[PDB]
Each structure stands twice: as C-alpha cells, then as structure tokens.
Amino acid sequence: KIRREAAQMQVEYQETQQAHTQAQLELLQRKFTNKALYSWMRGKLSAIY
C-alpha cells in the first residue's frame, strides 16, 4: 500500500509536469516578440523591399 501511495504521487508529479509545461507554452505565446510581430515584420519588409 505504501508502494501504491508512491505510484499515485508519481502520477501527481507527472501531472504537475504537464501543468507547468502547459504554463510554459502559454507564457511563450504571451511573450512580447511573437507571431503577430513577426508577420508585421515579413509583410512590411516584403512590400517595402
């Protein structure tokens, strides 16, 4: 039964792993330099060039 508890807390460990990887993804999308800025870059540079 202590082994079972250890397995369950391993499950919650990896669940927290998924949680903070999702947090990493969302903060990366919330960063300043992003897809909208880079699309502005590409479009303006293409036309003016």
Binding site: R3, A6, Y13
Partner: protein
Amino acid sequence: IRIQQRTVDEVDADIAVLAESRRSAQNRLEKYQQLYDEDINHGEQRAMS
C-alpha cells in the same frame, strides 16, 4: 525526493517483513529441535519394556 523517501519506506518495510520472518522461522527451529533431541519419551520406553 518524496518518491525515493517512499522507496526507503518500502525497503525498510521489507526488512521488517524479514525480521518477523526470522521470528516465525526461529520459532519453527526451536520447536523442531525440541522434538528431535527429546526423541522418545518415558511412556514409549515403558511400552517397549
């Protein structure tokens, strides 16, 4: 770290298992030794005589 603490709990639970294994096995040991070294009792030598 919590996982491996639980693992240490597993291993020392196992060594407690083996300690009471010693208790039971040694109990068997003295029972069998008492049976063997006493061998044949005065009632049986009385019957034989």
